[PDB]
Amino acid sequence: GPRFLKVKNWETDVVLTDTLHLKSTLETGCTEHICMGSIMLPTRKPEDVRTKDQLFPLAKEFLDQYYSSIKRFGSKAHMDRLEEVNKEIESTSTYQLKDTELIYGAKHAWRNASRCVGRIQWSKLQVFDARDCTTAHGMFNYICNHVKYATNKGNLRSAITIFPQRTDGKHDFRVWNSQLIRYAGYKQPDGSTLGDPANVQFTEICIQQGWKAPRGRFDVLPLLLQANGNDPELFQIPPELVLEVPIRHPKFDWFKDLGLKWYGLPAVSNMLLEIGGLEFSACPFSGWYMGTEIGVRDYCDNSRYNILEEVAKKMDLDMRKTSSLWKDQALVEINIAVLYSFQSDKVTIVDHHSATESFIKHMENEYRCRGGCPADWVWIVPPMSGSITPVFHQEMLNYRLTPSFEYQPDPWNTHVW
Amino acid sequence: GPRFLKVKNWETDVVLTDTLHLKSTLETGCTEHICMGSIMLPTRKPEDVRTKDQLFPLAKEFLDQYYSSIKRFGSKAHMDRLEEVNKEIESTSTYQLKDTELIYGAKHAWRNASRCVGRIQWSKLQVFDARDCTTAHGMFNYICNHVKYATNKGNLRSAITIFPQRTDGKHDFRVWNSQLIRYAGYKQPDGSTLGDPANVQFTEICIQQGWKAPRGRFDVLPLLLQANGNDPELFQIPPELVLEVPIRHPKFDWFKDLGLKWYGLPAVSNMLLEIGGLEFSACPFSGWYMGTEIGVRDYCDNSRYNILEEVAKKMDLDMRKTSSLWKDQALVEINIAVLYSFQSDKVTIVDHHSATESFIKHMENEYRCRGGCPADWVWIVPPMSGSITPVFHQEMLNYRLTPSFEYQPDPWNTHVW
Ligand code: HEM
Ligand code: HEM
Ligand SMILES: C[C@H](O)[C@H](O)[C@H]1CNc2nc(N)[nH]c(=O)c2N1
Ligand SMILES: C[C@H](O)[C@H](O)[C@H]1CNc2nc(N)[nH]c(=O)c2N1
Ligand SMILES: [Zn+2]
C-alpha cells in the first residue's frame, strides 16, 4: 500500500513483496476509480503505423534492459550498439535486431505474458528466425518446420517463429489463422453448426478463396498466409505433420462412440510481438495443452462444440433441473478422458492441478530473482475447479512489461485488391 | 474506450454501455499502470475516526442522491433536510438518518456490493433498526430476532440489522464474530484440527472469555458482542433458532456416514456499512446460501474442512496422481449432496447455475434502468465449473459506489481493559 505492493496467498498466508511493477511501461486500462481487470480486449491515426522518431526511445529502452540483463549496462558495447541503432533508424526509419537480442526479446515477451500459466518454461523457448522470408510459400515452409519441430512426435517442445517486422511500404506479414491448427465450422441453414462455431467466418473466407471444404466435423483448416502485404494464399498443412488424438474414457467405453478427437499442438498465430519498438505481426508460437483448454472451453463452451448436452443423455444424467449438476458431472468426465487419451497416445499434456502448482512455483522464483511476476488472475485460474487449485487463493498484481505479445485486429477486416 | 465504457459477453456477443461508473466516489486501488483486481483487501491518523468537518459533504452527497431517487432534487423538503442536517452536525458533530433514508441506504449498499452475485434481490431487503440498542444483551436480542426472522423455518428471507453508528466517545458496537453462525475449530497439539480451521483463533478467544467448549466437530460458536465500546460478552445462540441440515447424497448412501452437516443461514457480521458518511460498524446481514459456498469453499478448501482426501478414499478414487482428477470428481459429488440435502429439508438454497443466470438477468436490468452495474468478476465467478456458468464469459466493470459495505479490522486486535 504505502510504498511497494504486497500479494498474499490466503491458503498459505504467504506474503510476497512486489517491486517489479514499478517497471511498468504500458497501461492496464484501469484508473484510480475503475477496474477493467476482466475486460478481454482493453494501425494508428497519423501514419499507418509507428514513427521513426518514436522508435529510438523504445529501442533504447529495450537495449538498456538487454545490456543490463547480461550485466554490461553502460559498457562500450552497450553505448556503441545504442549509437549504432540510432544511425540505422535515421537512415532507414527502422532497425534490425541482432539474433541474440531477438531471442532474449521473445523469451521475455513470454516471461511477461501475464495471462499465461505455463510461464515456468519461458527460458526453454526455441526461436526460429524467419526474418529473411519474403513470400507466403516461404511462410508455409517455415510454419511446417515449426509444427514438426514443436510436435516432435508427441514429445512437445516450445517454439516461436518470427517473420519480418512491420515497415512503411513493403507491407506486413500475417498468418490469418487464429491458431496454426484448428478445425473448420459449418453452419447449415438448418440452424445446426457442424464443426467449430468459433471458426465459421474464417472457414467461409477459406471457401471463398478456393478451399474445397470436406464438410466434416473435425476438418483441419488450411493456412491462410499473407506475406509482404499481398493477398493471402491457401495452404493445406501436411496431414502427416498434424498429430491428432482420438478421445476415449478410461472407464466409460461408450465415450469413444461420441467420435471425439483433438489436435495435440496449440499454436497461437494472430498475436503481435513487440521488441525494442519493432512490431512482428506474424510470430506463431506454441507450447503444449493444459487439459481444460480442450475439455472445458473447446468442447463445453456453448459457443464452441457445446457437447455437454449430447454427453448428458449418454450418461443418462438427470436433466430436469441444473440443481442435479448434470453439467458439472459431464464436465469432469470429459476432462478425465481428454487427459487419459493424450497420456495414452504419449502426447504431451498437463492437467490444471500440476499446471497451476507449477505457476505458483514460478511466481515465487520470480519474486525472488526478478522482484515480481505480472499475472492476470482472471486468465490464470482454470475454467473449472478453480477453488481447488493453488492459484485461486493467490493474489496477483497485473501490469504490462515489455517486450510483450499484443492483440491486433483481424486482417480480412481491412484487406484490399 | 473513448467516452463511455462498454462490456461484452463473449458467449452471446451482447455489448452493454456503462455510464454509471462515472458515479464512482471511492477508489479501486488500481492505477493506469497496475491492476489490483484480484487483491482481497485493497480508525484513522488524525482523530480516532472521521471528522465533523468532512461529514457534511458526505451527508449532502447521500441526501442529494436520495432525493434524486424519489424524483425531488432541489425541492423544499430536499433543501430543508440539507440545512437541517448541516445544523445537527455543527451542534453534535454527527447526525441521525431518518428511517426511510436508512432503508434506502442499506438496500443500495447491497445494490452496490460489486462482489455479491445475489443482487437481483437487493430491493426485498428487510431492515431492522437497532439504533436504540445500548448494551450487548440488547444486541443479543436483536440478533436472535434477526436469525428467527431470516431463517423463517427454512423459507429464508433477506435481512440486515443496523446497530448504533460510530461516534466520538460512547465508543462503538461490534459483533466480534465474522458470521452470526459458524462452527468452532480446535487444534490438537497432534497437529490435527477438529472443526473449522478458519475459526481456531476466534474459538480460542471465546474459551479465554469463559466459553465452555464442547470440543466437537460442528460446535456452533457463541456470539461475542461489543456494545458502546465495552468489553465483549459471550452469548449462546438459541440452538432452537439455529436451523441445521444433515448432508446426504441422493445416490451414494455411504455419504451420510461422513457425518456432515451445515447451517442454513449465512450471516456476515464483521463488515461496516457506510451511509451519508455515517459508519455502522455493526450491521449483520443475511440472505441465503449458494451451494458452492458450502460444498466447495467450506468443505474443500485445504485451509477449511478439507474433506476431499477423506471423501476420496471412500469413493475408492485413483489417488496416485492428480491427472485422474479424483479431486474434481469428489468435488462435484459433495456439491450434489449439499444441494440435495437442503432441498430435501426444504431449506432455501441456490445452485451456482441458477444463481449466475440470475445475476446476468440483473446486470441487464441495471444497465437498462441505472446505466450500469459494478461487478467484481473475481468474486462473481463460482469457485467451480466457472466456464459453464454465464458469468465467466461476461466482462465486468468494477467500481465503488456509495452507500456501501466495507471491511474493517478485527476488534480483538485493539481492544483494552
Ligand atoms: C509450454 C507450455 C505452455 C502452456 C502449458 C501454456 C498455457 C497457457 C494457457 C492455458 C493459456 C490460456 C489460453 C486461453 O485460454 O485461450 C495461455 C495463454 C497464453 N500463453 Fe501460454 N502456455 C505455454 C506456452 C506458451 C508459449 C510458447 C508462449 C509464447 C512464447 C505463450 C504465450 C501465451 C500468451 C501470450 C497467452 C495469452 C494468449 C491470449 O491472450 O490470447 N505460451 N497459455
Ligand atoms: C439473497 C441471497 C444472497 C445470495 C445468494 C448472496 C450470495 C453471495 C455470494 C455467493 C457471495 C460470496 C461470499 C464469499 O465467497 O465469501 C456474496 C458476497 C457478498 N454479498 Fe451477497 N448474497 C445474498 C444476500 C446478501 C445480503 C442480504 C447482503 C446485504 C444486504 C449481501 C451482501 C454481500 C456482500 C457485501 C458480499 C461481500 C462479502 C465480503 O466481501 O466478504 N448479500 N453474496
Ligand atoms: C486471492 C483471491 O482474490 C481470493 O482467493 C478470492 C478469489 N475469488 C473469491 N470469490 C468469492 N466469492 N469468494 C472468495 O472468498 C474469493 N477469494
Ligand atoms: C469475460 C472474461 O474476461 C473472459 O470470459 C475470460 C475469462 N478468463 C479466461 N481465461 C482464460 N485462460 N482464457 C479465456 O479465454 C478467458 N476468458
Ligand atoms: Zn484493475
XYZ file of C-alpha atoms in Angstrom, chain B residues 21-401:
381
model
C -19.075 4.191 -13.454
C -18.847 7.964 -13.748
C -20.692 7.970 -10.388
C -17.646 6.421 -8.709
C -16.776 8.170 -5.440
C -14.283 5.709 -3.954
C -11.007 4.370 -5.384
C -10.463 0.815 -6.659
C -6.824 0.553 -5.653
C -5.827 0.269 -9.324
C -3.716 2.758 -11.322
C -3.173 3.462 -15.015
C -0.233 1.070 -14.739
C -1.340 -1.596 -12.238
C -4.323 -3.818 -11.558
C -5.237 -4.900 -8.052
C -8.389 -6.586 -9.310
C -7.543 -9.836 -7.530
C -6.451 -8.258 -4.251
C -8.675 -9.270 -1.323
C -8.235 -6.289 1.000
C -7.111 -3.253 -1.042
C -9.738 4.170 12.629
C -7.557 6.919 11.136
C -4.431 9.055 11.597
C -5.694 12.402 12.960
C -8.801 11.651 15.005
C -9.728 8.132 16.092
C -12.278 8.239 13.269
C -13.974 10.557 10.765
C -14.341 14.293 11.409
C -17.318 16.641 11.766
C -15.984 18.898 9.005
C -15.756 16.114 6.422
C -19.128 14.677 7.415
C -21.499 17.189 5.830
C -20.086 16.831 2.297
C -20.628 13.068 2.522
C -24.095 13.620 4.014
C -25.033 16.043 1.237
C -23.798 13.558 -1.368
C -26.141 10.880 0.006
C -29.165 13.142 0.578
C -28.821 14.624 -2.904
C -28.701 11.076 -4.240
C -31.623 10.132 -2.023
C -33.918 12.976 -3.100
C -32.985 12.377 -6.728
C -34.026 8.725 -6.376
C -37.514 9.803 -5.327
C -37.500 12.491 -8.006
C -37.476 15.564 -5.750
C -33.999 17.001 -6.264
C -33.867 20.666 -5.314
C -37.313 20.691 -3.704
C -38.150 22.355 -0.386
C -38.021 19.063 1.511
C -34.639 18.346 -0.069
C -33.174 21.790 0.619
C -34.699 21.815 4.095
C -33.320 18.406 5.101
C -29.881 19.523 3.923
C -29.829 22.640 6.089
C -31.367 20.579 8.885
C -28.542 18.021 8.802
C -25.984 20.783 8.444
C -27.257 22.069 11.808
C -27.212 18.699 13.590
C -23.592 18.181 12.544
C -22.409 21.573 13.780
C -24.238 21.036 17.061
C -23.485 17.374 17.815
C -20.625 16.526 15.435
C -22.864 13.946 13.760
C -26.442 13.399 12.606
C -29.250 10.839 12.629
C -30.692 9.304 9.486
C -34.442 9.135 9.023
C -35.915 5.637 8.928
C -36.715 5.891 5.208
C -33.187 7.086 4.387
C -31.645 4.248 6.398
C -33.715 1.744 4.427
C -32.775 3.274 1.064
C -29.177 3.391 2.273
C -28.983 -0.270 3.247
C -30.696 -1.544 0.096
C -28.401 0.490 -2.131
C -25.340 -0.568 -0.174
C -26.366 -4.083 -1.202
C -27.164 -2.969 -4.747
C -23.627 -1.563 -4.902
C -21.850 -4.624 -3.467
C -19.770 -5.489 -6.549
C -18.786 -8.863 -5.062
C -22.330 -10.171 -4.491
C -23.880 -12.449 -7.088
C -27.243 -12.476 -5.335
C -28.019 -8.820 -6.090
C -31.140 -9.462 -8.132
C -32.829 -9.475 -4.679
C -31.446 -6.129 -3.412
C -34.871 -4.455 -3.234
C -36.578 -7.045 -0.993
C -34.280 -6.303 1.920
C -35.910 -6.176 5.357
C -34.188 -3.580 7.519
C -34.234 -3.898 11.292
C -33.462 -0.613 13.044
C -31.440 -1.408 16.150
C -30.147 2.122 16.603
C -31.788 2.424 20.043
C -29.802 -0.548 21.337
C -27.316 0.298 24.103
C -25.994 -2.954 25.599
C -24.597 -6.318 24.488
C -27.577 -8.189 25.946
C -29.624 -5.758 23.911
C -27.663 -6.741 20.794
C -28.195 -10.442 21.509
C -31.953 -9.947 21.479
C -31.886 -8.039 18.206
C -29.698 -10.731 16.645
C -31.905 -13.601 17.837
C -34.891 -11.945 16.212
C -32.908 -11.422 13.007
C -31.957 -15.102 12.761
C -35.513 -16.169 13.567
C -36.994 -13.733 11.042
C -34.359 -14.596 8.429
C -34.420 -18.379 8.889
C -38.219 -18.354 8.753
C -38.308 -22.137 9.254
C -36.339 -22.839 6.084
C -38.061 -20.312 3.828
C -35.171 -17.829 4.126
C -35.670 -14.073 3.913
C -33.013 -11.399 3.335
C -32.451 -9.018 6.236
C -29.928 -6.747 7.908
C -29.873 -5.368 11.468
C -28.302 -1.943 11.913
C -26.858 -1.065 15.326
C -25.821 2.434 16.536
C -23.432 4.427 14.329
C -19.814 5.098 15.290
C -19.195 8.300 17.299
C -16.583 10.293 19.223
C -16.728 8.892 22.751
C -19.523 6.445 23.544
C -17.330 4.025 21.585
C -18.817 1.635 19.037
C -20.786 -1.531 18.506
C -19.181 -4.637 17.017
C -20.181 -8.266 16.569
C -16.788 -9.881 17.042
C -17.890 -12.936 15.012
C -17.129 -12.968 11.268
C -20.565 -14.541 10.760
C -23.511 -14.862 13.184
C -23.491 -18.664 12.829
C -20.182 -20.535 12.352
C -18.532 -23.633 13.819
C -15.633 -23.747 16.271
C -12.193 -25.057 15.358
C -9.881 -26.959 17.684
C -6.171 -27.579 17.131
C -4.829 -30.619 18.996
C -1.054 -30.469 19.634
C -1.211 -33.615 17.493
C -1.240 -31.277 14.512
C -4.783 -32.251 13.589
C -7.588 -29.696 13.651
C -11.076 -30.657 14.804
C -13.725 -28.391 13.314
C -13.263 -25.254 11.212
C -9.568 -24.228 10.972
C -10.652 -20.744 9.908
C -12.203 -20.346 13.353
C -9.382 -21.584 15.580
C -8.248 -18.149 16.800
C -11.763 -16.861 17.362
C -12.562 -20.084 19.220
C -9.503 -19.604 21.427
C -10.776 -16.119 22.298
C -14.206 -17.467 23.230
C -12.595 -20.034 25.533
C -10.410 -17.408 27.220
C -13.589 -15.383 27.763
C -15.192 -18.279 29.632
C -16.855 -20.346 26.911
C -17.150 -23.992 27.940
C -16.335 -25.515 24.559
C -17.807 -28.984 23.850
C -14.810 -29.924 21.650
C -16.924 -31.314 18.829
C -16.645 -31.195 15.031
C -19.681 -28.983 14.394
C -19.964 -26.850 17.565
C -21.818 -23.597 16.885
C -19.783 -20.700 18.288
C -21.142 -18.304 20.927
C -21.850 -14.732 19.855
C -19.194 -12.336 21.157
C -20.876 -8.922 21.241
C -19.450 -5.480 21.912
C -21.722 -2.557 22.744
C -20.883 1.104 23.288
C -17.218 0.080 23.257
C -17.274 -2.088 26.363
C -15.618 -5.480 26.709
C -17.361 -8.105 24.528
C -19.810 -10.523 26.172
C -20.497 -14.194 25.364
C -23.960 -15.388 24.337
C -25.069 -18.852 23.233
C -27.383 -18.575 20.238
C -30.618 -20.444 20.961
C -29.979 -23.858 19.351
C -33.710 -23.913 18.649
C -33.143 -20.894 16.394
C -30.195 -22.408 14.520
C -31.554 -24.354 11.568
C -29.092 -27.082 10.528
C -29.007 -29.553 7.644
C -27.510 -33.081 7.723
C -25.655 -33.808 4.464
C -26.565 -36.913 2.450
C -26.215 -37.981 -1.200
C -29.171 -38.810 -3.484
C -27.219 -41.818 -4.830
C -24.346 -42.692 -2.504
C -25.807 -43.961 0.765
C -22.256 -44.091 2.134
C -22.143 -40.297 2.015
C -24.211 -39.971 5.224
C -21.516 -41.832 7.157
C -19.129 -38.928 6.589
C -21.228 -37.305 9.314
C -21.546 -33.981 7.529
C -23.848 -31.096 8.371
C -24.032 -27.331 7.787
C -26.187 -24.424 8.977
C -28.712 -22.886 6.624
C -28.282 -19.210 7.462
C -25.257 -17.329 6.095
C -24.974 -14.055 8.015
C -21.943 -11.806 7.538
C -21.363 -9.787 10.683
C -17.924 -8.155 10.567
C -18.454 -5.579 7.833
C -19.042 -1.835 8.082
C -21.993 -0.162 6.398
C -21.432 3.462 5.397
C -24.260 5.823 4.508
C -24.184 9.601 4.175
C -20.844 9.394 5.938
C -22.226 7.620 8.990
C -20.376 4.432 9.933
C -22.302 1.425 11.230
C -19.621 -0.953 12.500
C -22.300 -3.494 13.449
C -24.728 -4.376 10.682
C -25.075 -8.176 10.423
C -26.809 -9.101 7.193
C -28.043 -12.331 5.615
C -29.704 -13.878 2.593
C -29.295 -17.495 1.593
C -26.566 -19.860 0.509
C -25.343 -20.602 -2.989
C -24.322 -24.267 -2.871
C -20.674 -23.710 -3.760
C -20.001 -21.544 -0.712
C -20.508 -24.697 1.351
C -19.713 -27.595 -0.978
C -16.567 -26.019 -2.374
C -15.093 -23.402 -0.068
C -16.221 -24.515 3.406
C -15.791 -28.260 2.836
C -12.991 -28.484 0.293
C -10.578 -25.570 0.854
C -7.314 -27.001 2.199
C -7.434 -24.355 4.913
C -11.067 -25.139 5.775
C -12.582 -28.573 6.465
C -10.502 -30.036 3.654
C -12.632 -33.186 3.354
C -11.574 -34.015 -0.225
C -8.971 -36.520 0.925
C -11.375 -38.271 3.287
C -14.085 -38.219 0.612
C -11.578 -39.613 -1.883
C -10.803 -42.974 -0.275
C -14.499 -43.571 0.434
C -15.155 -43.390 -3.303
C -12.068 -45.533 -3.934
C -10.866 -42.830 -6.331
C -7.488 -43.210 -8.027
C -5.235 -41.041 -5.855
C -1.901 -41.852 -7.499
C -1.712 -38.617 -9.494
C -3.962 -35.569 -9.859
C -4.294 -36.388 -13.560
C -7.060 -38.780 -12.506
C -8.863 -35.625 -11.406
C -10.051 -37.516 -8.327
C -10.279 -34.145 -6.571
C -12.516 -32.754 -9.298
C -14.770 -35.795 -9.055
C -15.029 -35.713 -5.258
C -15.869 -32.016 -5.613
C -18.929 -32.489 -7.807
C -20.487 -35.211 -5.664
C -20.040 -33.150 -2.475
C -21.886 -30.264 -4.121
C -24.635 -32.503 -5.424
C -25.211 -33.737 -1.868
C -25.223 -30.257 -0.291
C -27.872 -29.100 -2.757
C -29.828 -32.336 -2.480
C -29.836 -32.175 1.311
C -31.001 -28.557 1.620
C -33.719 -29.106 -0.959
C -34.926 -32.240 0.838
C -35.014 -30.473 4.201
C -36.891 -27.679 2.407
C -34.206 -25.144 3.352
C -33.669 -22.325 0.843
C -30.579 -22.689 -1.350
C -29.435 -21.873 -4.883
C -27.074 -23.748 -7.218
C -24.306 -21.794 -8.970
C -26.061 -22.164 -12.340
C -29.365 -20.555 -11.421
C -27.504 -18.011 -9.280
C -25.188 -16.818 -12.061
C -28.002 -16.848 -14.605
C -30.000 -14.570 -12.278
C -27.051 -12.209 -11.774
C -26.804 -11.862 -15.566
C -30.505 -11.054 -15.731
C -29.807 -8.464 -13.013
C -26.851 -6.837 -14.843
C -29.011 -6.254 -17.915
C -31.869 -4.749 -15.877
C -29.426 -2.396 -14.147
C -27.689 -1.363 -17.364
C -31.171 -0.537 -18.669
C -32.570 1.350 -15.657
C -29.458 2.525 -13.817
C -26.960 2.694 -16.680
C -24.636 0.113 -15.222
C -23.795 -2.394 -12.531
C -20.450 -2.620 -10.717
C -19.278 -6.232 -10.549
C -16.136 -7.992 -9.337
C -15.541 -10.815 -11.819
C -13.072 -12.470 -9.463
C -15.814 -12.862 -6.838
C -18.773 -13.293 -9.149
C -17.475 -16.372 -10.979
C -18.177 -19.520 -8.901
C -15.303 -21.486 -7.279
C -16.095 -24.471 -9.533
C -17.258 -25.039 -13.120
C -16.719 -21.350 -13.804
C -16.550 -21.839 -17.559
C -20.016 -23.361 -17.843
C -21.794 -20.558 -15.973
C -22.892 -17.436 -17.940
C -20.836 -15.050 -15.809
C -17.437 -16.470 -16.762
C -17.918 -15.080 -20.283
C -19.322 -11.752 -19.085
C -16.960 -8.788 -18.957
C -17.486 -6.741 -15.795
C -16.585 -3.187 -14.860
C -15.689 -2.842 -11.195
C -16.009 0.465 -9.318
C -17.029 1.698 -5.866
C -20.391 3.376 -5.376
